[PDB]
Amino acid sequence: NARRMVQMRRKLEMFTYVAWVPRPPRLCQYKNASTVNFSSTNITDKRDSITHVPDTVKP
Amino acid sequence: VATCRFYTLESVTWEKDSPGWWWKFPDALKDMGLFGQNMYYHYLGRAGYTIHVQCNASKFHQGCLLVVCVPEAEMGCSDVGGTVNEHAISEGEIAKKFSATATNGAHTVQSIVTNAGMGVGVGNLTIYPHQWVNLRTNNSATIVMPYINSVPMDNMFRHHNFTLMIIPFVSLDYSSDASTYVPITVTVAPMCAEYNGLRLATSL
Amino acid sequence: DCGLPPDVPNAQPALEGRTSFPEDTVITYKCEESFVKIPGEKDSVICLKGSQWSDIEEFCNRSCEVPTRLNSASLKQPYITQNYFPVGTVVEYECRPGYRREPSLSPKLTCLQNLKWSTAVEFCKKKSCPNPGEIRNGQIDVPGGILFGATISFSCNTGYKLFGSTSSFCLISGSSVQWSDPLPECREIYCPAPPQIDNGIIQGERDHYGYRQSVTYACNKGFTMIGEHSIYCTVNNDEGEWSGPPPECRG
Amino acid sequence: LMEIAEVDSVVPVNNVVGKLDTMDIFRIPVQSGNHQSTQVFGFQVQPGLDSVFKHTLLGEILNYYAHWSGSVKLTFVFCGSAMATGKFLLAYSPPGANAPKTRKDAMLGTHVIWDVGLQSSCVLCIPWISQTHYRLVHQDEYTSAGNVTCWYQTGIVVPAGTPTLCSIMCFVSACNDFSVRLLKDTPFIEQSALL
Ligand SMILES: CCCCCCCCCCCCC/C=C/[C@H](O)[C@H](N)CO
Structure with missing residues (x-):
């Protein structure tokens, strides 16, 4: 089974059948190979505010 | 004509704080007249579906829903070490409710809406067939789902072909004295239903 | 004295260890295994005058065991x-x-x-118990159905504490079956006080902070912020705790 | 895979503190009143590196590749009441200058003025304006792609009995000229031991 090393598993699970019926890439960390069990994962990483774009042109 | 017809499930209440709901199919129709009966007496089944979701509200209500059908929505357990009960995936005509926080318990699904019970980004569910119900724009969503599986036919009890999810990205909101009860109603119709393996009815 | 009592098919006489029986002795027979005595029939003989037993006819016949015990x-x-x-x-x-x-x-x-x-x-x-229903901000574990004798258990989502019964059983209640205990309530857990910081303030501090709610810090004029601009309430094992230290405001 | 990337996916623009595990991560807050001076939202065009985009369908696909090229579609949908009307200025500012601090500065770049009506969505297409044919997914200042900002063009006007606070959602997809290369492993999945 291709479910114990995480990279190839995540690559293959981008499709439902192998390709047919693409799926949203696994966001959470894999826990075991028997299941799809996961700990609840943040949607993304935080930034300072909703308008936050850091200055890159400065002396 | 006896199975390929619209069946209406129990409606759900869209509140200001409602993570969402989901239903697995065909389990959601295991009691819909002769469609369910044919399911009990046959070993194989194959049908498309026309899913119609209804949510009507005034122009002074604001809200948005995601209606998405997920083929092979293998859910995950809140306890990372363990399995799920059929009851934790589907209550039949009754909907399973997502949560706004992490869930605990034995054999229950990790139903935090952000991960959609599948360890994926909820915002990425648009890859599946989907529609949105924006109260300012529309009041119904229609999806035509053919039979999707890795085999021509399969048992309708042992396998959930697809899961229907309704997830409000924009919470329902209204004003002082507008209607507070805004329900969501789901209507599903099988299409081109076939059955094989006729024998005595199974018992759950 | 009579001698041995008559042989009876599928029955055995109680002789009680002797072989000669004084007059008027009454000997009773019991049916052998897989045989039942026929109601309304003699099961015994008596030693009459002249050292002779009274006649007895077959009184044993067939039958099924006692019906096996059913739980239902x-x-x-x-x-x-x-x-x-x-x-x-x-x-x-x-x-x-x-x-x-x-x-x-x-x-x-x-x-x-x-x-x-x-x-x-x-x-x-x-006999089935009613629908267990639903717990707001919690979950009902139903592991084996809701029929007579079933067990269900209750929990609360992250950031909520259970008040009430943690389980319930489908038990007999007079004419029917009912749940032993009612549904519990999941009340929001409140974090401790967000710690004030030297030379900075909390922006619009609130009375109570619940799960994932955030406290935003701001330094006073002339002071430089070092650290997270805000912290938020975590909740585990029914206890709240801030996500980490507040920022420093250094001059 | 580009077929997948060309599908709209909701963008956690409001990736602020605390709301990283809510649905509100996908909602940009707007409201009625005099709030023109207040910017609505702003982020860098880093489809595979910035926290705003790296976990979307487009971002996840890109993280398997080292180079990307092509235009990006940003679709914004107004999710308020049908009785609420407003106009917004969605601007894309190529790199070389700091992000705008006012509507006047942002208007000088590539922008579209969005009118809210029966059509609830508008598309701000980010053109491919690059000195190179490709950009790094792990973007640096050499491969910077610019920024996107939104400002109240007029504001939001609502009648009596209507909610005063509304929300906007942003979807991201790839145009038909988008392309990636240099397959690589993604840094969003890791383990410490055989599962
Ligand atoms: C002489 C030694 C021969 C070694 C044979 C090793 C592989 C034999 C079975 C290959 C079949 C598995 C192919 C991979 C598919 C995956 O496991 C999943 N089913 C697809 O997601």
Whole structure:
């Protein structure tokens, strides 16, 4: 089974059948190979505010 | 004509704080007249579906829903070490409710809406067939789902072909004295239903 | 004195260890294994004058065992007190508490010719408890159904504490079955006080902070912020705790 | 895979503190009143590196590749009441200058003025304006792609009995000229031991 090393598993699970019926890439960390069990994962990483774009042109 | 017809499930209440709901199919129709009966007496089944979701509200209500059908929505357990009960995936005509926080318990699904019970980004569910119900724009969503599986036919009890999810990205909101009860109603119709393996009815 | 009592097919006399019997002795016979005595018949002889026993006819015959114990149904009167069940005997059952009749099925068993009872069908089916419902901000674990004798358990989502019963059982309640305990309540957990910081403030501090709610810090004029601009309430094992240290405001 | 990338996916623009595990991560807050001076939202065009985009369908696909090229579609949908009307200025500012601090500065770049009506969505297409044919997914200042900002063009006007606070959602997809290369492993999945 291709479910114990995480990279190839995540690559293959981008499709439902192998390709047919693409799926949203696994966001959470894999826990075991028997299941799809996961700990609840943040949607993304935080930034300072909703308008936050850091200055890159400065002396 | 006896199975390929619209069946209406129990409606759900869209509140200001409602993570969402989901239903697995065909389990959601295991009691819909002769469609369910044919399911009990046959070993194989194959049908498309026309899913119609209804949510009507005034122009002074604001809200948005995601209606998405997920083929092979293998859910995950809140306890990372363990399995799920059929009851934790589907209550039949009754909907399973997502949560706004992490869930605990034995054999229950990790139903935090952000991960959609599948360890994926909820915002990425648009890859599946989907529609949105924006109260300012529309009041119904229609999806035509053919039979999707890795085999021509399969048992309708042992396998959930697809899961229907309704997830409000924009919470329902209204004003002082507008209607507070805004329900969501789901209507599903099988299409081109076939059955094989006729024998005595199974018992759950 | 009489000699040995007469032989009776499928019956054995109680001799009590002797072989010569004084006049008027009454000897009783008991049926052998897999035989039942026939009601209304003599089971004993008596030593008459002239050293002669009275006549006795066969009084033993056949039958099925006592019907096996069913968890769903119990034998009705008078079958529940009976032990003689010859071939063709039909008994009747009634549902035990927790079960109710399946009307399309017969609650009767027949003793067959091979001395066994006929095939058991579920003429009494489990009595079911009501829908357990739902717990706001919590979950109901139903691991094996909601029928008579079932167990369900309750929990609360992250950031909520359970108040009330943690489990409930489908038990018999008079004429029906009901849940032992009502649904509990999941109340939001409140974090400790967000710590004030030197030379900075909390922006619009609130009275109570619950799960994932955030406290935003701001430094006073002339002071430089070092650290997270805000912190938020985490909740584990029903206890709240801030996500980390507040920022520093250094001059 | 580009078929997948061309599908709209909701963008956690409001990736602020605390709301990283809510649905509100996908909602940009707007409201009625005099709030023109207040910017609505702003982020860098880093489809595979910035926290705003790296976990979307487009971002996840890109993280398997080292180079990307092509235009990006940003679709914004107004999710308020049908009785609420407003106009917004969605601007894309190529790199070389700091992000705008006012509507006047942002208007000088590539922008579209969005009118809210029966059509609830508008598309701000980010053109491919690059000195190189490809950009790094792990973007640096050399491969910077610019920024996107939104400002109240007029504001939001609502009648009596209507909610005063509304929300906007942003979807991201790839145009038909989008392309990636240099397959690589993604840094969003890791383990410490055989599962
Ligand atoms: C002489 C030694 C021969 C070694 C054979 C090793 C592989 C034999 C079975 C290959 C079949 C598995 C192919 C991979 C598919 C995956 O496991 C999943 N089913 C697809 O997601």
